[PDB]
Amino acid sequence: MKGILGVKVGMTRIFRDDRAVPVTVILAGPCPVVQRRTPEKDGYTAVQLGFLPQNPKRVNRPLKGHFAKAGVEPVRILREIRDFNPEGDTVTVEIFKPGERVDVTGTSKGRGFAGVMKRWNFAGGPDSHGAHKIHRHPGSIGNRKTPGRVYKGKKMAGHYGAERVTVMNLEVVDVIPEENLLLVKGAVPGPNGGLVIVRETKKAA
């Protein structure tokens, strides 16, 4: 029921314990509280967090510099963490000692048009024997004159990549609050240089 923003840093292997660890590190960044959300006036429960302060002339207009507390804008907008309500402060990492697995929600790298082969993982055919014609084709679809049609959501030759992906449950290896680091078990969607948020997971009760 917790959360904080961040950005993708490394992926390495810290020789913690005596076991190597593929470790995504995430610069969680000092993401300030701002325009809060209640269910009386909005209809849910969330908090707005802007990422990294880099904003002057090129920001312009409203600002929640207005809000009541300012801070201008980050450099790349703010996001809403559901079920969240701090206590009137800015937040970075400290709210998570190690031992606290969390889901990590981030954007995903884009593969443009994906061939059906490298999307839903198909065979394509034989490396000779038959015809070189198909070779890497999605085979056939539905039956003859009945169905009579094709299936809405049939695994097909289309797009794959520029998507939103939430990964689930990873041991928070350690927290560096002296800067802005949050190192957990390696995974995390997207490039080594794109936005990614942290949210507390669901396991026991």
Partner: peptide, 12 residues
């Protein structure tokens, strides 16, 4: 928050 290398080398 640039110099990503520097970071990844600080956790070293």
């Amino acid at each position: 928050m640039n110099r990503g290398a520097l970071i990844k080398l600080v956790e070293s």
